[PDB]
Amino acid sequence: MVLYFIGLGLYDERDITVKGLEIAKKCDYVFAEFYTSLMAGTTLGRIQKLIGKEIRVLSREDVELNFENIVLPLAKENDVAFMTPGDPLVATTHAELRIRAKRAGVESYVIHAPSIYSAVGITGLHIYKFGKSATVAYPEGNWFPTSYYDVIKENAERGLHTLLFLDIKAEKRMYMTANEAMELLLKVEDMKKGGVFTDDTLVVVLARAGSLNPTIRAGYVKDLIREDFGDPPHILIVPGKLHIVEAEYLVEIAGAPREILRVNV
Amino acid sequence: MVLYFIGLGLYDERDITVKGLEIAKKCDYVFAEFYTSLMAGTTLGRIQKLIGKEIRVLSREDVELNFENIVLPLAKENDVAFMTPGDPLVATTHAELRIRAKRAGVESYVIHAPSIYSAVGITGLHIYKFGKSATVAYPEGNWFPTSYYDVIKENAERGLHTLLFLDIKAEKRMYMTANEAMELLLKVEDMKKGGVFTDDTLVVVLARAGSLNPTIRAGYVKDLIREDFGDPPHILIVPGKLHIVEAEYLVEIAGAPREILRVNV
Ligand SMILES: Nc1ncnc2c1ncn2[C@@H]1O[C@H](CSCC[C@H](N)C(=O)O)[C@@H](O)[C@H]1O
Ligand code: NA
């Protein structure tokens, strides 16, 4: 008689929580979307096999325009689950769907799963030091998004780290790489000339968090701009002022140049 | 030869991921710490039964001072797990433990799990809007720390939300309640007179995130300062200016007063 929002986790089907799996196994109907993020280590089948149910995958349009016509009607007389990559309410507009559920007289519950937002901890950067986050969006036609550049500036001015979600166009099989993000940022810097993002800027790249062997790299843009970080998904991070131990981790674990060990306090 | 950092999740024993559970079950030795946080919805016994291994509990000193003498030696010739509440490497000093592992010639891998950092998305507040985070600490003796107040000030001023962790004495099993945090903040405001935290400030309280029935409440301090939010753990958030969609969620899901739709947007 309820609707469950269940996160699938970072990388593969095993990133779901035990709680999420046991509840998903007993739901009458299971829906999911795979446009808000990319789970590079699994397939729909592997997820269906684990949960033991057929899964109706919905498009962005099905959800944003027809969630109350496709999913909610069933939750009024059945236990329904809506599954998503990572945590269902992180960097998505899915929270608003709980409002739609309420208006349709449907109770909803949320089962969390590991999210890229907290996975940044594996970069060695203190998570409490992250400031406002942003998304590097693909330019479209004459429209060239740039607000994410200002976020970095605002955070850097405060000595805070900046988490940059990268764009995704699932229907086009498009997943922005950290390289493409760095190129776009260099272009905005050329236009705004704020000294925010240059070839000498230290950045951190995290690719395929959740996998056992994610790619964790730190260094200057000039050096990483063309480095191969492996398959998507990727996130780009622009650190603010570093603590001694953050620099030590970036060097020992992320292969950063030993020169960043020397911090200018 | 391998050390696994495994997150336990948010609330109870089912908050660990399928990946984390299967890996823990294959480890020869399993260690855990509950000094950074406690799994309020479960017990050591229930966790132990689920994993089917005896769990070696470690104190803050065991970890910070002797991780390399207690955990790493065993990791040399066995598969060892180090489990922590939430997502591994979120606690500020844990990332450095991977450096110790490296120095000991021990391979380490991270198995993620839900963290309050991402779980707060259930409050309906957009994750990208959170700024620097902080912890509300109890004053004691001649020491009256107030940095967390400045963090709120710096975030709000930029239209950002502030995630506030509340003081905890794991050993004594003493939790600071949201009610106590609000009282402390009002006291700090009376001192700095910054107009940052008053009876008219809008706050959000999240209790028992991870549970199927968490407490999510939003409203003005004057109305919530004496409200019962249930058993801990409690998390306090001071939102910046709200996106109308954030406000609508708080009203419809968190029982916030209609007033926020015009006053805090
Ligand atoms: N495993 C992963 N590794 C690296 N980046 C990831 C990732 N999962 C998600 N992202 C990043 O986040 C973007 C999707 S944003 C949606 C995030 C999701 N709800 C969560 O909780 O993680 C991707 O385009 C990518 O930039
Ligand atoms: Na944050």
Description of the molecule:
The structure is a homodimer of 265-residue chains. Chain A is of the alpha/beta class. The first copy, chain A, folds into 2 domains: 1-114, Tetrapyrrole methylase, N-terminal domain (Cobalt-precorrin-4 Transmethylase, domain 1), CATH 3.40.1010; 115-265, Methyltransferase, Cobalt-precorrin-4 Transmethylase, Domain 2 (2-Layer Sandwich). Chain A is built from 10 helices and 12 strands. In chain A, the strands form 3 sheets. Chain A has a 5-stranded parallel β-sheet with strand order 3-2-4-1-5, with helices on both faces. In chain A, strands 6-7-12-10-11 form a 5-stranded mixed β-sheet. Chain A is elongated. The termini of chain A are far apart. At the A-B interface, helix 1, helix 5, strand 5, helix 6 and helix 10 of A face helix 1, helix 6, helix 7 and helix 11 of B. Bound molecules: S-adenosyl-L-homocysteine and sodium ion (NA). The site of sodium ion (NA) has 3 residues of chain B, from loops.
